[PDB]
Structures are given as structure tokens and as C-alpha cells.
Design a protein around this ligand. Structure first.
Ligand code: ATP
Length: 377
């Protein structure tokens, strides 16, 4: 019994290979991914959906984005940057970051590694409930840009969770495995993995020859993701509200919220229809907001940001010393890759090359990991 675990920044996912097929395991709540969140309350510690779904009530003691800290030193540029966005306290313990919370009435602190071991204990359990067996063997994946210390902190995290880590595998390599690209035979191939999520955006170029993988270059954008596509919708609709009602909803938090949630939803809908309607009663000062947006207007609100996703592509290709002619395969992972327009720019840019995108983009990392875990076991 061996699983693959995508230990994620925001969401984690676990997969098992059985009856010749990966099954992606739903959690106790029915969800096939699970927030990488840990909440400390007056009485208990919650993990997964229970934790995410009380953030508003208890933000000070709800820890998330631990992958951002795992295996890093306190004065790491990434630690210092992100801290300004987290409501829980990050503490400097003699060079290493720690997360300070109130737990069962007590001040408590946790290395990011411990917090990530909590998520993995939950993922382990998710598979044990599916399977009606104890699970211990896992393949766990990390980012291609993880240095030794971060890889080690991540293995140590699986070990504390009672896991036998068969292997630590880069996320893009896991995704290439899911499409059986390690099975192709003959000459070497260059493969680009385009991974666009909610905040993260990671591009990776790998070499594959005879099943044997090699990272060639990596490139990122900390400031491009789906949240940014939603912002442009909010701005568009807040200006629509003003043109029609001469009222400014921007100073009302709950109104802005109802509108963002709706946008975020209508976005997902535009990924597979050509228009989305939104009706929100009494959105602001008793004023109803019924509107609609087309795919076209959506893409247009975002045309510069879509195009902008091609720049980490060009950095990645130039560090890897390859013309974009010599890329054989493009693999799409991360939820934002579902946006048809983004798929279209990528197909045109890699005119005549194959886009692998048919496995659920939020599940491909865990899919290939699960595939490889069954092999190593
Ligand atoms: N059908 C869809 N169309 C457009 N965007 C989508 C769709 N489904 C999900 N998304 C977007 O994908 C984004 C998040 O994807 P993902 O689950 O990869 O988050 P993430 O932060 O990358 O997770 P992790 O940090 O664990 O990688 C959200 O911004 C969401 O709106």
C-alpha cells in the first residue's frame, strides 16, 4: 500500500494506484484536495477543511502557507516578504522561523516542518479511511527550486507523520510521469511544465531520455495568478456599479466579498461556457446587482496578464539554452490552466507541439506521484 502526496502551498492532494488506475482520494468532507491549513483553538487542533472554514473566527491562530517557510532561514527574502501578509506570528528562533499561536490557552510555537507534518498526518489518514488499511509508504513531491535544506525539512516532515518516504520527487517531474512521458522511447526530449495556480506560477524545463529526468531551468512569477484575474473582474464590476448607481461599494468589506466570490465563480464558468450571469440582491445600500460577463470581455480584462505568462516561459527557455523550437511537450498543471485563452496562447507559442492538459490540473502532481509510489513499494 503506497500513496503519492502532493504537499501543496494552499491545497494538498493524495492519490493511490490500484486496479490499474489512479484513484484520487476524497477526504472526510468529500473533497479531492484538502487545504494545507492548521488551526489551533481553545480546545483542539483542526487540519484541512475544518481549519480553513474557521479562519474568519480565529485568524490569529490559523496557520497556512507553511511550504513558504519550510526549510528556510528567518532572513530568507521569501519569509520576510510573505510575513507581511499572514495574520499569525512568525518568530525568529536563532535563525529559523517558527509559527507562534494560542493553543488550549497557551502560547505555543511550531517549526514550519512540524506544521507540514500535521498536514501529511491528515493526508495519510485520508488514504487510510479510503483504504481500510494502515498507510505508511508515500512518495511526496516538492518544487524543482527546493534546495537541499527544504527537501530535507520536507522528508523530516513525512517521517514525523509516521510515513516511510520512498522518495521526494519534483512537482513537474510528477506531472510528466502522470502523462506517461517517462515511457516514450528514442531520442531525448525537452518538456516544459506550465504551472499556473492562484498565487504561484512555476515554469520548468526538463529533459527526458529513456525514462531518465533532468531539470534544465526553472522560472517563476510570485505576482501572477488567478487572484489577479479576479481583481480585474472586481474592478470592472465595481466601475459598472458606479456608472449605473453612482455609489462606491469599495468601502464595504462584505459587499466587496460577495462580489469577489461571484467573480471567482463566474470565472470558472467562463472556462467552459461563453458567458456568465451574476445576480446579487441588495449588494450595497439595498441596491441589487444583476449583471453578466462574456468570455471575450473576461479575456480582454486580462489580456496583458495572459500574455504576461509567456515571460517566465522565455526566462526558463533562455536559462535552459533552448529555442522554443526544441520543446517537444508542454504539460499544464494548476487550476488557472483551465482558462481556454491561456491554453490558446500556449498552443500558438508552441505552434505544432503537444499540450498535455487532459488530467485534472489540480490532481496531476498527485496522480504521477501515486503512479511512482506503487512502483517503488
Ligand atoms: N475552471 C477554472 N477556470 C479558471 N480558473 C480556475 C478554475 N478552477 C480553478 N481555477 C483557479 O485556480 C486557482 C487556484 O488553483 P490551485 O488549486 O493550483 O491553487 P494554488 O494556490 O496553485 O494551490 P497550491 O498553492 O496548493 O498549488 C484559483 O485562483 C482558481 O480560481
Amino acid at each position: 500500500p503506497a500513496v503519492g502526496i502532493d504537499l501543496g502551498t494552499t491545497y494538498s492532494c493524495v492519490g493511490v494506484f490500484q486496479h490499474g488506475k489512479v484513484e484520487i482520494i476524497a477526504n472526510d468532507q468529500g473533497n479531492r484536495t484538502t487545504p494545507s491549513y492548521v488551526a489551533f483553538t481553545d480546545t483542539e487542533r483542526l487540519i484541512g477543511d475544518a481549519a480553513k472554514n474557521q479562519v474568519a473566527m480565529n485568524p490569529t491562530n490559523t496557520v497556512f502557507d507553511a511550504k513558504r517557510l519550510i526549510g528556510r532561514r528567518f532572513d530568507d527574502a521569501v519569509v520576510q516578504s510573505d510575513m507581511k501578509h499572514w495574520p499569525f506570528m512568525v518568530v525568529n528562533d536563532a535563525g529559523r522561523p517558527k509559527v507562534q499561536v494560542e493553543y488550549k490557552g497557551e502560547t505555543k510555537s511550531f517549526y514550519p516542518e512540524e506544521v507540514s507534518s500535521m498536514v501529511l498526518t491528515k493526508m495519510k489518514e485520508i488514504a487510510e479511511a479510503y483504504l481500510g488499511k494502515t498507510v505508511t509508504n508515500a512518495v511526496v513531491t516538492v518544487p524543482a527550486y527546493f534546495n537541499d535544506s527544504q527537501r530535507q525539512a520536507t522528508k523530516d516532515a513525512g517521517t514525523i507523520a509516521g510515513l516511510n518516504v520512498l522518495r521526494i520527487i519534483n512537482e513537474p517531474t510528477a506531472a510528466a510521469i502522470a502523462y506517461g512521458l517517462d515511457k516514450k522511447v528514442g531520442a531525448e526530449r525537452n518538456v516544459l511544465i506550465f504551472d499556473l495556480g492562484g498565487g504561484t506560477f512555476d515554469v520548468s524545463i526538463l529533459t527526458i531520455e529513456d525514462g531518465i529526468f533532468e531539470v534544465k531551468s526553472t522560472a517563476g512569477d510570485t505576482h501572477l495568478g488567478g487572484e489577479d484575474f479576479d481583481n480585474r473582474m472586481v474592478n470592472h464590476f465595481i466601475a459598472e456599479f458606479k456608472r449605473k448607481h453612482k455609489k462606491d461599494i469599495s468601502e464595504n468589506k462584505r459587499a466587496v466579498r460577495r462580489l469577489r466570490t461571484a467573480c471567482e465563480r463566474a470565472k470558472r464558468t467562463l472556462s467552459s461556457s461563453t458567458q456568465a450571469s451574476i445576480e446579487i440582491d441588495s449588494l450595497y445600500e439595498g441596491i441589487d446587482f444583476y449583471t453578466s460577463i462574456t468570455r471575450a470581455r473576461f479575456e480582454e480584462l486580462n489580456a496583458d496578464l495572459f500574455r504576461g505568462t509567456l515571460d517566465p516561459v522565455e526566462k526558463a527557455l533562455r536559462d535552459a539554452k533552448l529555442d522554443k523550437s526544441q520543446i517537444h511537450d508542454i504539460v499544464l498543471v494548476g487550476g488557472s490552466t483551465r482558462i481556454p485563452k491561456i491554453q490558446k496562447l500556449l498552443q500558438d507559442f508552441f505552434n505544432g507541439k503537444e499540450l498535455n492538459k487532459s488530467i485534472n490540473p489540480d490532481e496531476a502532481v498527485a496522480y504521477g506521484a501515486a503512479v511512482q509510489a506503487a512502483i517503488l513499494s
